[PDB]
Symmetry: C3
Subunit: 149 residues, 3 copies
């Protein structure tokens, strides 16, 4: 019977949707995602900003963005080295915005940053001490993506 | 056409089920699962026993349980900190049982443990050195889940 | 209904196929896979060569094979301890071939290796320092699987 097979197929598809959802949960858990918190992942590869941005988006995430000290600390722990943050002032010099929209609020600028040094610096990296430095978007820094809570 | 379409979709589904099964195997492997051994994993987050139980159960797992000295060590090195074990004596004081049912067989209690200190201590935690301590279930310890061998 | 349901189910299947691809990409990413580079994974378990092969085949990969100094170091950094390479002279004594077929193109043999020492040595392990030594395929070494770029 055609309808019986179709009904079975529906059940099979729904069963797969739930198993996949579980696979995703377990992987996030195994990757250190904390309950009700965003999770950060890195392959430890250094690349220019646009490449990090393209990579994270492909994975359905975004370049990591610290919204407070806890998150900033978590990103630093994950990155282990200087990494790009999802913050830039490429649209209008001086006004840093999140790659996902909106003006930068919480910050952790290193002493004397941001300074748009020399020919210009429109991207931001969280350096080893967790402090921030605006740098050239063309420099290669560790790719770190964040995924929703 | 409908009979063929349906037949070909069922085949697609079977391939996808196998592919998902592969993803699960590769993930466990990457997370250090040893052949014929249970898979222990943690996100490194500390919480009350009731939560770890709910969390592990949501991932189709249970709170880690050392059935012998080998598994007890395996759990210790995964947790890195004091983690809840799937054992409590909430039913009969002194009679510790696994959350999955059954009487406690292997144990690695610390000197003077269990002591059911203060108002009571019905949960168990494997402390840093692998030794056990009975502790209040309302306290917050590392969440470590186990998955079948 | 029937054809509408069937059309929806094809859409459901394709959507699920994309989500799973996404899941695999994110896992490879978290597993340290760099762009355009093959990647290596290990559960850190020691086992005879035949088991490494079986395990990697089940994961749809192959035993790690270094094609150049770049990959040789990458394999060594993942294994951390001596691991089997997908290279053996089992078919014809003295003729080292890749498990995937073909004669060696790159080699980092430690001085005086390979020597088929004593009762015989047909497998190869990358020692902690990257050099190669032919050893017994019966010995238990770290399993490192290789996945395509
Ligand atoms: Ca500018
Ligand atoms: Ca600027
Ligand atoms: Ca600067
Ligand atoms: Ca009690
Ligand atoms: Ca008690
Ligand atoms: Ca106690
Ligand atoms: Ca031989
Ligand atoms: Ca030989
Ligand atoms: Ca030798
Ligand atoms: Cl720039
Ligand atoms: Cl208690
Ligand atoms: Cl041999």
């Amino acid at each position: 019977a055609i309808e019986v097979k179709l009904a079975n197929m529906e059940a099979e598809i729904n069963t797969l949707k739930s198993k996949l959802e579980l696979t995703n949960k377990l992987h996030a858990f195994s990757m250190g995602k904390k309950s009700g918190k965003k999770f950060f992942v890195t392959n430890h590869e250094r690349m220019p900003f646009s490449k990090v941005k393209a990579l994270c988006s492909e994975l359905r995430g975004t370049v990591a963005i610290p919204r407070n000290a806890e998150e900033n600390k978590a990103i630093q722990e994950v990155a282990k080295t200087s990494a790009f943050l999802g913050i830039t002032d490429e649209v209008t010099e001086g006004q840093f915005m999140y790659v996902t929209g909106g003006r930068l609020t919480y910050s952790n600028w290193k002493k004397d940053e941001p300074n748009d040094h020399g020919s210009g610096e429109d991207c931001v990296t969280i350096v080893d001490n967790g402090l921030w430095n605006d740098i050239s978007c063309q420099k290669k820094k560790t790719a770190v993506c964040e995924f929703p809570a």
